Amino acid sequence: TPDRLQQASLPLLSNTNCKKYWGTKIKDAMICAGASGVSSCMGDSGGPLVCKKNGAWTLVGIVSWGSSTCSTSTPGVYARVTALVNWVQQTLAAN
């Protein structure tokens, strides 16, 4: 493990294309990214996948799961925040 915070840029994939790698394991509340020469890996879980939209960094994914060897040619799987944001807002509002 590294002492210092790391970063990587990587592309988003479609779920349909991600299913070529992962099959039926890909569900609608998941988004895939990577297969580009980089990979998230153990200890990255829970952290951000951010994309810039209208000048601001927006949380699109939460690091979730992927290859057991952190293969850089296989996509990583992230929790898809658009599918989850209504629950976030309901929880903040009630608590």
Binding site: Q6, L10, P11, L12, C41, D44, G47
Partner: peptide, 17 residues
């Protein structure tokens, strides 16, 4: 967020398996 968009991820996870 369209397929092919370049985004960023960050963390202190492993750098080699």
């Amino acid at each position: 967020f369209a397929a092919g968009t370049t985004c960023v991820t960050t963390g202190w996870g492993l750098t080699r398996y």
